Amino acid sequence: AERPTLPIPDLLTTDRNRIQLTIGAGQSTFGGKTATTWGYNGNLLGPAVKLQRGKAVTVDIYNQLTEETTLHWHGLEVPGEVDGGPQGIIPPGGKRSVTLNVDQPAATCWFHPHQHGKTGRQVAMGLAGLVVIEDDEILKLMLPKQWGIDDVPVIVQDKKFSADGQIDYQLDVMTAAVGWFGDTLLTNGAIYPQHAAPRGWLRLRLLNGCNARSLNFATSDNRPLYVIASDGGLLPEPVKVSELPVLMGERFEVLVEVNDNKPFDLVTLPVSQMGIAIAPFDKPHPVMRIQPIAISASGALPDTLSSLPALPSLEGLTVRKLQLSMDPMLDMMGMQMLMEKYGDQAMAGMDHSQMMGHMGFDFHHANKINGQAFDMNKPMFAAAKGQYERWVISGVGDMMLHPFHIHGTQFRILSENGKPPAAHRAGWKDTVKVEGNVSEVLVKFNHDAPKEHAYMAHCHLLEHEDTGMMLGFTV
C-alpha cells in the first residue's frame, strides 16, 4: 500500500493578539488499531505557534482533560511566571492566559506538559507542540520557507502499544532506570509517512520528541545534511554532516538536497544507549520517505547565516556544580527488570566497558541532583539575573545518558561530556549531553523567576525527571 502523507501541524498566528490552545483527549489510529491520545487543538500532538521577536502575544490555554497539566515553552527565554514548569498547574476545566514577550533570535522551540512526576505519561499520551520564532535577520536569508512544502517540521517519537492498541505507558523501576521506550516510531504521529518535496533544497525542522530515545539522523543513500540551526537558532554558517545525533528535546534545522526524482529515506541509525539499542532500533530505521516532485521551490543554502559572538572571558564567573546520580538499587532493580523483559537481547549496543559499569526503597525519589530528589517547595539556589554563570553538570559515577536541559535560557556549551562541542553544537543550545563525564555550559537568565514560579534544570530523559532528577532555581 502507499505510505501515508506526513501530517503537517497548522501554523497558528495571533488573532486581538491572542492565541487559543485546547488540551483534550481523543482518538488516533496506529497500524490499523485505535488508541486514546491527547492533543493541543486536536487528537494528537499540536500546532506550530508562530511568534515574532519584539511582538507580545497572549495565549489562552484550556485544560479539557480530567487531570491537571502544565504548559512549558521549551527553549523560550520568558519569566518563570509563564514558563509553565510543575508549579503552573491548570486544573481540569480550568484556563490560564500567558503573555509571551518574545526577546530572542529566530529558532524552532516546542511546548509540552511539565506536570510534577507525570511529564513522561502526558508526553507519551500525545501532548507536544512547536514554536516557530521569526526575526528580521532570518527572513532576509531566502532559506526554504513554504511551511509544509519545503519548510517541514519532523517530530520523531517512539511509543509502545498494548494488545488492544492502547499506549502502554508505565513509570516502574525499569523505566525509572533506562526510560520509557517502544518498538514503534512515529513521525508527526504517523508510521513511516512520505513527504512530497519540490526539487532543490528541503528544510527539515527536526525535534526529538521521545521520552527516552536518542536518535541519529542520516539519509538512506548517504547524501549529506546541512545543519543551519540548533535549539536556540541559527549557526553562523552551515555545517555539513553525514549523521546527526539528536538528544531528547533537542531541535536542529537541516537542509537536504532533493536533486533527482528518485525517492530516499530519512533514517535513524543505531545508538549505543541501553534499551534504546534493542531491535528494531539495532539496524538503520526509516523515519520518513522523501518523494521528489516538480512544483515552485526557490529556497537556497546561504554561505553565511548569522554572527555568533565570541565567548566572554570565564574569570570571575559564578560556578555551579550539579552532580547527577541514581541510587545503586534503582540501577540494579531496573537492569534486572530490563533483562527479564528482553533476555539475550537486553545488552544490545553495549560494549565491555558499558556492561562492567553495571558490576558484572522508593524508586520515585531515586534519581537525584546534588544528592537530592526534586523538592518542589525548596529551590536548590538563587541564580543572578542578566549575569553569565558557569554550570558544571557531571554524570561521573553513573552509566546512563542524561540530556540536561535548563529553563529560561539559551546557553553556549564550553565542554560537552569531556570534549569541546561539535561545530553544529557550538551555537545556541538549551540541552547538553551528560553521559559518564562532565559538561560545562555558559548560561545567562535575562528574566525573573521567584520561588513560587521557579525555573527547572533537569534531565530530559522524562522518567529520570519524574523520579527526581530535577532542581528548581530562582533568578
Q: Between 268 and 467, whose beta carbon lies closer to Cu ion? A: 467
Set of cell numbers at residue 198:
519540490
Tell which positions 406-425 bind Cu ion, by CB under 5 A.
407
Eight-class DSSP state of 55: -
CB of 325 to Cu ion, least distance (A): 10
Q: Residues 293-332: x/- map of binding to Cu ion (CB under 5 A)?
A: ----------------------------------------
Which residue, 175 or 219, has its beta carbon nearer to Cu ion?
175
- The reply to whether 368 sits near Cu ion by the rule CB under 5 A is no
Nearer of residues 320 and 407 to Cu ion, judged by Cβ:
407
- Quick one: which segment of 33-41, 179-187, 262-270, 404-412 binds Cu ion (CB under 5 A)? 404-412
Whichever of 120 and 224 has its CB closer to Cu ion, that residue is: 120
Is the Cβ–Cβ distance between 387 and 318 less than 8 Å?
yes
Q: Are 473 and 380 in contact (CB under 8 A)?
A: yes
Give the integer Cα–Cα distance in Å for 105 and 108: 10
Of 19 and 131, CB closest to Cu ion? 131
Cis preceding-peptide flag for 280 (omega within 30 of 0): yes
Q: Which long-range contacts (CB under 8 A, 24 or more apart) does 315-320 make?
A: 317/388, 317/389, 317/390, 317/442, 318/384, 318/387, 318/389, 318/390, 319/389, 319/390, 319/391, 319/392, 320/381, 320/383, 320/389, 320/390, 320/391, 320/392
Options 29-37, 329-337, 440-448, 451-459: segment touching Cu ion (CB under 5 A): 451-459
Instruction: Select the residue interacting with Cu ion from 50, 53, 424, 464 (CB under 5 A).
Output: 464
Q: Which amino acid is it at 243?
A: E
With CB under 5 A as the rule, give the number of residues binding Cu ion: 6
Amino acid identity for residue 396 in this structure: V
10 Å CB burial of residue 288 (0-12, 13-18, 19+) is buried
459 touches Cu ion by CB under 5 A? yes
Q: Is residue 74 close enough to count as binding Cu ion by CB under 5 A?
A: yes
Q: Which is nearer to Cu ion, 151 or 398 (CB)?
A: 398
Q: Residue 233 forms beta bridges with which residues?
A: 230
Closest CA to 308 of 384, 418, 387, 229: 229
Stretch that binds Cu ion, among 96-104, 119-127, 336-344, 405-413 (CB under 5 A): 405-413
Cβ at position 200, least distance to Cu ion in Å: 34
Residue 203 Cβ vs Cu ion, minimum distance, rounded to whole Å: 24
Of 289 and 402, nearer to Cu ion (C-beta) is 402
Select from 124, 154, 131 the least CA-distant residue to 6.
Answer: 154
- In the shown chain, the binding pattern of residues 25 to 44 toward Cu ion, with x for contact by CB under 5 A and - for none, equals --------------------
376 with 116: CB under 8 angstroms?
Answer: yes
Contact status: 171 vs Cu ion (CB under 5 A): no
**Least Å from the CB of residue 72 to Cu ion:** 5
112 contributes a contact to Cu ion by CB under 5 A: no
β-strand pairing of 264-268 with 215-219? antiparallel
| 290 grid coordinates | 522523501
Closer residue to Cu ion, CB minimum distance, 398 or 440: 398
- Closest contact distance (angstroms) between CB of 34 and Cu ion is 32
Q: Phi then psi for 97, rounded to 5 degrees? A: -105, 135
Nearer residue to Cu ion within complex by CB, 151 or 231: 231
Location of C-alpha cell 497572549: 58
What residues pair up with 194 in beta bridges, in sequence order?
A: 5, 289
* Contact with Cu ion (CB under 5 A) among 90, 288, 461, 475: 461
Which of 402, 412, 429, 453 forms a contact with Cu ion (CB under 5 A)? Answer: 402
CB of 401 to Cu ion, least distance (A): 7
Whether the CB-CB separation of 116 and 364 falls below 8 Å is answered with no
Q: Which is nearer to Cu ion, 203 or 412 (CB)?
A: 412
Which residues here bind Cu ion, judged by CB under 5 A? 74, 402, 407, 459, 461, 464
